[PDB]
Amino acid sequence: AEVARAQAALAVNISAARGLQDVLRTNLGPKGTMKMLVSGAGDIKLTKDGNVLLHEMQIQHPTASLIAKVATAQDDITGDGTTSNVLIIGELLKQADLYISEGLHPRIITEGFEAAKEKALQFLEEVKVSREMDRETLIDVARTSLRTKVHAELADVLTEAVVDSILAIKKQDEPIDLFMIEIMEMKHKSETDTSLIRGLVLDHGARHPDMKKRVEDAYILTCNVSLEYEKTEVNSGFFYKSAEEREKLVKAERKFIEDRVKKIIELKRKVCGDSDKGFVVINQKGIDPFSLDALSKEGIVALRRAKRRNMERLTLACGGVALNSFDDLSPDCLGHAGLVYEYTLGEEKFTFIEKCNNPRSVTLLIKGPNKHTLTQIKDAVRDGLRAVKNAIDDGCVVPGAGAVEVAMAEALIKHKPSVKGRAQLGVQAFADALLIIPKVLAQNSGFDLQETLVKIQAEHSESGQLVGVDLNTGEPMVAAEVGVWDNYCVKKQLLHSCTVIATNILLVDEIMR
Amino acid sequence: EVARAQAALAVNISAARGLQDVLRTNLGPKGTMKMLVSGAGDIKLTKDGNVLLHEMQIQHPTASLIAKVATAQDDITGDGTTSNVLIIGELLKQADLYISEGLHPRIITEGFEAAKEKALQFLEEVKVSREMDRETLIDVARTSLRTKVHAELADVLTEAVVDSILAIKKQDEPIDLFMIEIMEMKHKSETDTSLIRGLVLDHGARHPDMKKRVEDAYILTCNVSLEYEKTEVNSGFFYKSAEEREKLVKAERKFIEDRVKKIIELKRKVCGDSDKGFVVINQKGIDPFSLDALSKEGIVALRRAKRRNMERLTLACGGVALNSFDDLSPDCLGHAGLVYEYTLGEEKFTFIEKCNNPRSVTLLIKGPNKHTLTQIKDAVRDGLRAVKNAIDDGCVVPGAGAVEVAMAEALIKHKPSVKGRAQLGVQAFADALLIIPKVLAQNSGFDLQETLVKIQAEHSESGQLVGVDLNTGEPMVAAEVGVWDNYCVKKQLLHSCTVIATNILLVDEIMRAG
Amino acid sequence: MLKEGAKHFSGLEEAVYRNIQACKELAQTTRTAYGPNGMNKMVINHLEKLFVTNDAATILRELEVQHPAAKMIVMASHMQEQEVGDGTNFVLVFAGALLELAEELLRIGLSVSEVIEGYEIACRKAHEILPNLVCCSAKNLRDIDEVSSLLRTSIMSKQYGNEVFLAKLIAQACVSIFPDSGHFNVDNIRVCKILGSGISSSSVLHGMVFKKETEGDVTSVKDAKIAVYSCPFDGMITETKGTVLIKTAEELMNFSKGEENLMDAQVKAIADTGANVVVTGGKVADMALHYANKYNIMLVRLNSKWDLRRLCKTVGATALPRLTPPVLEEMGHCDSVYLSEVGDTQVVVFKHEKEDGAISTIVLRGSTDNLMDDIERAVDDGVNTFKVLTRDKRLVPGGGATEIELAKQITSYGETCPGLEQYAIKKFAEAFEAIPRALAENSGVKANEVISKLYAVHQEGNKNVGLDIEAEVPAVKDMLEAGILDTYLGKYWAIKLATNAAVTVLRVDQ
């Protein structure tokens, strides 16, 4: 129906966009703060992570959709930097406003952003320098990547743990983790903690007096459904709806049980000898008491409650292949894990598999009795594994904590274009957009936001130094000497995603109801 | 009842912002003429920044403040007051962006202080010496008049203004405070402005053609009355008896008779021939009877002249002003080399020109007696104050926002004091200046960014003060064209802008007062 | 606003839009005016009569506007009223038309200041091609047909029913006493209304006409110099009254004796001083009359304000209140004083014969004074068009026949120059087109048809249209050869002042 045209209509778009970024301005670095999000579903999500906050619920606007769409693109590739993204787009718009409001065209500002941006990708290629893929160098990047997502204390616990996860590749270098994601969550004494368990860990386990607690030569056969019913891969029906039905269901479970156990004891003997090596069976459903007695005595370790998600990972880790029935299977096709041991902590049982043949699965064990703690620590892990993952794949990494932002801004030097001045508006706006990253650290910390920034420009003038605002005191420093460096992937994908979004906002001069 | 902190700063910026709009369409020759009927309802035609603030009704404290500081600038230069407002507005705008993000007013102020010192030293570097020739005075004269009127009428006023300043060198003043007598003539066109060397008189004789060419003029300027009629007075009021009033009427008339007689004796003593004339200028009447007698002797006697005519005559002519006539030597009376009477319009103006010992020139503006003739009066006014500055300073720069881009470029690049505290105000100071050139482009219809990148680059390559060609709104070298600005114009926008800014910036409360 | 200072009623939106729409409303009274028309505009003002006009000067002064933009043009129109006659209407329609066209320019994205510049240019080119549109001119001013063709256009602009009689009449009664070559007087010609009789019965009389009846004897001497007094009689002594009738009976005897002896002296002082025609705006008593019969003085019973005014301008007279004997100082340039009845009413006739300072009177006879007020507009403009101060007045095609010629030249010329100026130059052509539009509206047909068919015939310099049936359908009439001519000077000031007025008002924003 109604239609807004011209610069009036463009105002409606940019003012909204600036306002979303203003709210989220509070986040970034560890001198930032968690934001409380409640959708329409209850539960307190306490997240400073921008990607989580955009998706679960956010202010309605047309630009609400755009800040999330670019958040979506960023997260999927790199999996860091979705807080970072928001603030530059905003500050770009601010600058663009001043000129249009003077009596200029949205479109000339837009073209100058494209010229401006292209010089800055090229700026990255110089400023970057190769740094090690050795463990301790990746600690210094991991410490920084965790800090832009979440608070200081939460960042510190996870540094060492996240590095050891991604290091246990086979020299398989990707930007993201695909199968080194395993979430195990626990309500425990320690309020916040993350534990490193290498190799794939199983959701719960069964234990018997006769069962072998420590097993040093585990031939895994992975099975699914079940000792309750023979010839199944999905569950059979039930009978109990009448009084008479109950008795029948239990009685014919004896036949079903009797057929199954036989398969397993005969396979154990081929592989292990009598009891001279150990045998592991994966029940993903109920384990009947009758079958727990026989398997346990025999030298067979039964495990109760595993997932379909464990099932995928287990196959890669042991070298075995999945079966969905409890039946005989050739020794060849069974996986080998060279250690299986069960640590029973709290009210859950974590059975580990260690000596993984092929490590592309690792497990982080999330402690947190409280709902409010669990949500903080757990959501930091995911954006954390993928952050460090970018650094190991990347051969070159860029200095961090606004080091590169201030350098690019000064080099891009005003009155370098002279073509029409259409390029001049853009290259000038883009300079001030980058310098948002100093500004928001400085806001979070003591002293005034521009007051710290002019000292960064000054120190930048002295060459041989990349200078930015610290994450942990909000003061000027040589970022490089402290060690605070950020992966290349964040910094490369930032530029492409920020320019496109904010370009489109100025192109919109007709918004239809 | 108080506006405190953010609320106090908010009030000032908002006002500056609406005002700025008005007085950009007065800026340079490409600005637009303005009239008031909003000041009092009557029709005024005015195109000066200070003047327009007085004529309106100003109640807003920020508008009023800008008008007060304006007053000082207007006296000295009379140009750059169209500009004062523009630089103030932008200067605030810059500050506002930083404050809103999170910045203190005081750090802004410090960097203004640093800004001001550097900016003033830049004037000293960049200034170009000029001569004191006519040609060079023509170009201060023409550009300043071009601000305050059209291009067409301004070129006519250019001639009048310049010959006066040359004549003022002869007196050896380094100032102007005389030769500023503006006299109006009755006409049917305004595209004439005439220069009259000596003085001009509002009214002439009531009897035409006494001797309307005086070869040798001996000017007695008097002011006692030679007409007081037949009215019955006593001390200038009615008295109780007829007779008592009458007795005085005889003696008063008798007094007048003797004074008219002294003109007859004076012509022989000073003159002696009719080969020389004799000039009388009386600011009070003279009988029709007395004019015929004087006229045949070869005396021109003027009636109903002003008190302003009298003071001017006494300076220029070397004349006297006396409350008596008597028999006086030509040593006391002033001399003028020429007298001519020029009748034009409905009122005839006796000129008394080529005075010996002048110190007053009259610039005689012809016009229809509309508001247009008042418009050239106030154009001519500030064009005299402009060429006064050229005599004051030694150095006149090419303008048209040429100076201002050069000064802004110098600030952006380095810290003038080398501290970050200064630096926050310094950005703000540099972009404030850019309003003056860019906006000449805006009026014309030429995009503002395009002229900034060009004008600034050409400075860098050359070292020329490249300016704006007003009409295209595209850059050109301001030197050749004649768009120039004095040392005093670019000094006084700078001083006014800083002082006015820092008292509004540093508000923290505005509380009402009875 | 944002300010509680800086007063404006114009600026922003209101300069661009509101000012133009106001100019447009004033100039609606002249898109029914100028040349062929049947429009009449009645305006009242509590003047105890109805005032009928189709002249811009009287419409404009009545009408007050509170905006400087609309108010300023009224002054430009008055300026053209002093220097020349008819075309006053043309000054206001032009400025007002140009300003409507201007606002459209502002809309597109063009700036104010170039548009302002392009008019000055167009005005200069239009005047430069203007004396090349002379097609006819006078050479003798004592020849009634060459003068009357000029006159005719002024009259036409009023009504299209009174063109023939009047245009002849003025030239017959003379406005050719002056050489009109350095010098012309227009306060030594008035238009004098005589109530009674028809308006084709409007007559020629030479020298000052005053309506008031003559009393006593009449003079025919050449020693007759005019003495003017507003009130020289009121009774030489005023009564007070103590019995609320008289104060009283023996006193009434003295009040009458003293009046008759003081009036004897006063009227004998007039007789002696060489004043042998006295104009009395007072009251003629029997005593005062009785004296003036003996001395031989022509006596003018009464005068009103209007009659006194023309004596002070023409004579070099003053009108003094009197009841104590005076003497000459009013003086006069009139030798002869005769007596002649115009309208069957006794009229006082002044005359002398000379070129400079010589007097004439276009005197009218009419049913009512209202009918005479419109006719008067036609006639006073016809005296003011005479003034050019040459005898070759360089007549250019009247009636709006020039207008299309100017428009064609200007639009082509516009194309040649580049930049933003040119659009203003084109608009400047279409502002002249205002005149052909107004003639079309009264004629009864649309604008499209007239402007196209005038253009179709190309360069002609004759084409204009009337109120007729010939004026509608083929939309072609000859107004070079109908003897519809106007003067070069009248069209010059009309176009000049109007361009100056349009530029100053387009500038405002305060």
Coordinates of C-alpha atoms in Angstrom, one line a residue, chain C residues 80-356:
Chain C
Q80 CA 6.0 51.9 -15.4
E81 CA 2.8 53.9 -14.7
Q82 CA 4.9 57.2 -14.2
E83 CA 7.2 56.6 -17.2
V84 CA 4.4 55.4 -19.6
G85 CA 0.7 54.7 -19.7
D86 CA -1.0 51.4 -20.7
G87 CA 1.0 48.2 -20.4
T88 CA 0.7 48.4 -16.6
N89 CA -1.3 45.2 -16.7
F90 CA 1.3 43.5 -18.9
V91 CA 4.1 44.3 -16.4
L92 CA 2.4 42.2 -13.5
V93 CA 1.1 39.3 -15.8
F94 CA 4.7 38.9 -17.1
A95 CA 6.5 38.9 -13.8
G96 CA 3.7 36.6 -12.4
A97 CA 3.7 34.3 -15.4
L98 CA 7.6 33.8 -15.3
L99 CA 7.4 33.0 -11.7
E100 CA 4.9 30.1 -12.3
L101 CA 7.3 28.8 -15.0
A102 CA 10.2 29.3 -12.6
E103 CA 8.8 27.0 -9.8
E104 CA 8.7 24.1 -12.3
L105 CA 12.4 24.6 -12.9
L106 CA 13.2 24.4 -9.2
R107 CA 11.3 21.1 -9.0
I108 CA 13.5 19.3 -11.6
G109 CA 16.8 19.8 -9.8
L110 CA 17.9 23.2 -11.2
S111 CA 19.3 25.8 -8.9
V112 CA 17.7 29.3 -8.2
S113 CA 20.8 31.3 -9.0
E114 CA 21.4 30.3 -12.7
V115 CA 17.7 30.7 -13.5
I116 CA 18.0 34.2 -12.0
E117 CA 21.0 34.7 -14.4
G118 CA 19.3 33.4 -17.5
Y119 CA 16.4 36.0 -17.4
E120 CA 18.8 39.0 -17.5
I121 CA 20.3 37.5 -20.6
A122 CA 16.8 36.8 -22.2
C123 CA 15.7 40.4 -21.3
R124 CA 18.7 41.8 -22.9
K125 CA 18.3 39.8 -26.2
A126 CA 14.5 40.7 -26.4
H127 CA 15.2 44.4 -26.1
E128 CA 18.0 44.2 -28.6
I129 CA 15.5 42.6 -31.3
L130 CA 12.7 45.0 -30.2
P131 CA 13.4 48.1 -32.4
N132 CA 13.6 45.7 -35.3
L133 CA 10.0 45.0 -34.7
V134 CA 9.0 48.7 -35.6
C135 CA 6.6 48.4 -38.5
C136 CA 4.9 51.9 -38.3
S137 CA 5.7 55.4 -36.7
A138 CA 4.3 58.9 -36.6
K139 CA 6.0 61.9 -38.0
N140 CA 3.4 64.6 -37.4
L141 CA 1.8 65.1 -34.1
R142 CA -0.7 67.8 -35.3
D143 CA -2.4 65.0 -37.5
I144 CA -5.3 63.3 -35.8
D145 CA -5.1 59.8 -37.5
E146 CA -1.4 59.1 -36.6
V147 CA -1.9 60.1 -32.9
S148 CA -5.2 58.2 -32.6
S149 CA -3.9 54.8 -33.6
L150 CA -1.5 54.9 -30.5
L151 CA -4.3 56.1 -28.2
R152 CA -6.5 53.3 -29.4
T153 CA -4.6 50.5 -27.7
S154 CA -4.9 52.1 -24.2
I155 CA -8.6 52.5 -24.7
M156 CA -8.9 49.0 -26.0
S157 CA -7.4 47.5 -22.9
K158 CA -10.3 49.0 -21.0
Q159 CA -13.4 48.1 -23.1
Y160 CA -13.6 46.9 -26.7
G161 CA -16.8 49.0 -27.1
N162 CA -15.2 52.5 -26.6
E163 CA -12.1 52.3 -28.9
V164 CA -13.3 54.4 -31.9
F165 CA -14.8 57.6 -30.3
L166 CA -12.2 58.3 -27.6
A167 CA -9.0 57.7 -29.6
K168 CA -10.1 60.4 -32.0
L169 CA -11.2 62.7 -29.2
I170 CA -8.0 63.1 -27.2
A171 CA -5.9 63.9 -30.3
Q172 CA -8.6 66.4 -31.3
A173 CA -8.5 68.1 -27.9
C174 CA -4.8 68.0 -28.0
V175 CA -2.0 66.5 -26.1
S176 CA 0.1 68.0 -28.9
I177 CA 0.3 71.6 -27.3
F178 CA 3.8 70.5 -26.1
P179 CA 6.5 69.5 -28.6
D180 CA 7.0 66.4 -26.5
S181 CA 10.8 66.4 -27.2
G182 CA 12.4 67.2 -24.0
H183 CA 9.4 68.4 -22.0
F184 CA 5.9 67.3 -21.4
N185 CA 3.4 68.1 -18.7
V186 CA 0.7 65.7 -17.5
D187 CA -0.7 67.8 -14.5
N188 CA -1.6 70.6 -17.0
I189 CA -4.0 67.9 -18.6
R190 CA -6.7 66.4 -16.3
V191 CA -9.7 64.2 -17.2
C192 CA -12.8 66.2 -15.9
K193 CA -16.0 64.5 -15.4
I194 CA -19.2 66.4 -16.3
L195 CA -22.2 64.5 -15.1
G196 CA -25.2 64.4 -17.6
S197 CA -25.5 63.5 -21.3
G198 CA -24.1 60.5 -23.2
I199 CA -20.4 59.5 -23.5
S200 CA -20.4 59.9 -27.3
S201 CA -21.5 63.5 -26.3
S202 CA -18.0 63.9 -24.6
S203 CA -16.6 67.1 -26.1
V204 CA -13.4 69.2 -26.8
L205 CA -12.6 72.2 -24.5
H206 CA -9.3 73.8 -24.3
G207 CA -7.7 74.8 -21.0
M208 CA -9.0 74.3 -17.4
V209 CA -12.6 73.0 -16.9
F210 CA -14.2 73.3 -13.4
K211 CA -17.8 72.1 -13.0
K212 CA -19.1 74.7 -10.5
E213 CA -21.5 77.4 -11.6
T214 CA -20.7 80.9 -12.3
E215 CA -22.3 83.7 -10.4
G216 CA -22.4 87.5 -11.0
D217 CA -21.0 89.1 -14.1
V218 CA -18.4 87.3 -16.3
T219 CA -15.0 88.7 -17.3
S220 CA -13.2 88.2 -20.7
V221 CA -10.1 90.3 -19.8
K222 CA -6.5 89.4 -20.2
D223 CA -5.5 91.0 -16.8
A224 CA -7.4 88.1 -15.1
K225 CA -4.9 86.2 -12.9
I226 CA -6.1 83.6 -10.7
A227 CA -6.4 84.0 -6.9
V228 CA -7.4 80.7 -5.0
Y229 CA -8.7 80.5 -1.6
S230 CA -10.2 77.4 0.0
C231 CA -12.5 79.5 2.4
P232 CA -12.4 83.3 2.1
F233 CA -16.0 83.6 3.4
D234 CA -17.6 81.9 6.4
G235 CA -19.1 85.2 7.8
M236 CA -16.2 87.5 8.7
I237 CA -17.3 87.3 12.3
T238 CA -18.6 84.1 13.9
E239 CA -21.6 84.3 16.2
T240 CA -21.9 83.1 19.7
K241 CA -25.6 82.8 20.7
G242 CA -26.9 83.6 24.2
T243 CA -30.7 83.3 23.7
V244 CA -30.0 80.2 21.7
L245 CA -31.0 82.1 18.6
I246 CA -28.7 85.2 18.6
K247 CA -26.6 87.0 21.1
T248 CA -28.8 89.2 20.9
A249 CA -30.7 92.0 19.0
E250 CA -28.6 95.1 19.2
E251 CA -25.6 92.9 18.7
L252 CA -27.0 91.2 15.6
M253 CA -27.1 94.7 14.1
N254 CA -23.4 95.1 14.6
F255 CA -22.4 91.5 13.5
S256 CA -24.1 92.2 10.1
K257 CA -22.6 95.8 9.7
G258 CA -19.0 94.6 10.5
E259 CA -19.4 91.6 8.0
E260 CA -20.5 93.9 5.1
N261 CA -17.7 96.6 5.7
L262 CA -14.9 93.8 6.2
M263 CA -16.1 91.9 3.1
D264 CA -16.1 95.3 1.1
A265 CA -12.4 95.8 2.0
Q266 CA -11.4 92.2 1.3
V267 CA -13.1 92.1 -2.2
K268 CA -11.9 95.6 -3.0
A269 CA -8.3 94.4 -2.2
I270 CA -8.7 91.6 -4.8
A271 CA -10.0 94.0 -7.3
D272 CA -7.1 96.4 -6.9
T273 CA -4.3 93.8 -6.9
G274 CA -5.0 92.7 -10.5
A275 CA -7.0 89.6 -9.4
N276 CA -10.1 89.7 -11.7
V277 CA -11.1 86.0 -11.3
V278 CA -11.4 84.7 -7.8
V279 CA -12.1 81.1 -7.0
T280 CA -14.2 80.6 -3.9
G281 CA -14.4 77.2 -2.2
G282 CA -16.2 79.0 0.6
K283 CA -19.8 80.3 0.5
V284 CA -21.1 83.3 -1.5
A285 CA -23.2 85.4 0.7
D286 CA -25.3 88.3 -0.7
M287 CA -22.8 90.9 0.7
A288 CA -19.8 89.2 -1.0
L289 CA -21.7 88.9 -4.3
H290 CA -22.8 92.6 -4.2
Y291 CA -19.2 93.7 -3.9
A292 CA -17.9 91.4 -6.8
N293 CA -20.6 92.8 -9.2
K294 CA -19.2 96.4 -8.6
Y295 CA -15.4 95.4 -9.1
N296 CA -16.2 93.2 -12.1
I297 CA -14.9 89.8 -10.9
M298 CA -16.0 86.4 -12.2
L299 CA -17.1 84.5 -9.0
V300 CA -17.0 80.7 -8.7
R301 CA -19.7 79.7 -6.1
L302 CA -18.3 76.6 -4.6
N303 CA -15.3 74.2 -5.1
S304 CA -14.6 70.7 -3.7
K305 CA -11.2 69.2 -2.8
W306 CA -10.7 67.8 -6.3
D307 CA -11.2 71.2 -7.9
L308 CA -8.8 73.0 -5.5
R309 CA -6.1 70.4 -6.3
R310 CA -5.8 71.1 -10.0
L311 CA -5.6 74.8 -9.3
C312 CA -2.6 74.5 -7.0
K313 CA -0.6 72.2 -9.5
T314 CA -1.4 74.1 -12.7
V315 CA -1.5 77.7 -11.5
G316 CA 1.5 77.6 -9.0
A317 CA -1.3 78.5 -6.5
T318 CA -1.9 78.1 -2.8
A319 CA -5.3 77.8 -1.1
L320 CA -5.3 79.9 2.0
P321 CA -8.0 80.1 4.7
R322 CA -9.0 83.8 4.9
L323 CA -11.4 86.2 6.7
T324 CA -8.8 89.0 6.9
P325 CA -8.0 90.8 3.5
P326 CA -5.2 89.2 1.4
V327 CA -3.4 90.1 -2.0
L328 CA -2.1 88.2 -4.9
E329 CA 0.6 85.5 -4.6
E330 CA -1.1 82.6 -6.2
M331 CA -0.5 84.3 -9.5
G332 CA -1.4 82.4 -12.8
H333 CA -0.2 81.8 -16.4
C334 CA -3.8 82.1 -17.7
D335 CA -4.6 85.4 -19.5
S336 CA -8.1 84.8 -20.9
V337 CA -10.9 83.6 -18.8
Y338 CA -14.1 82.9 -20.7
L339 CA -17.4 81.4 -19.9
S340 CA -18.9 78.4 -21.7
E341 CA -21.4 75.9 -20.9
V342 CA -20.5 72.3 -21.1
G343 CA -23.2 69.7 -20.2
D344 CA -25.7 72.5 -20.1
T345 CA -24.1 73.4 -16.9
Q346 CA -22.1 76.7 -16.5
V347 CA -18.4 75.7 -16.6
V348 CA -15.5 78.1 -16.0
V349 CA -13.1 78.1 -18.9
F350 CA -9.4 79.2 -18.6
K351 CA -7.2 79.5 -21.5
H352 CA -4.0 81.0 -22.7
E353 CA -2.1 79.9 -26.0
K354 CA 1.5 78.8 -25.8
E355 CA 3.5 75.5 -26.1
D356 CA 5.1 75.1 -22.8

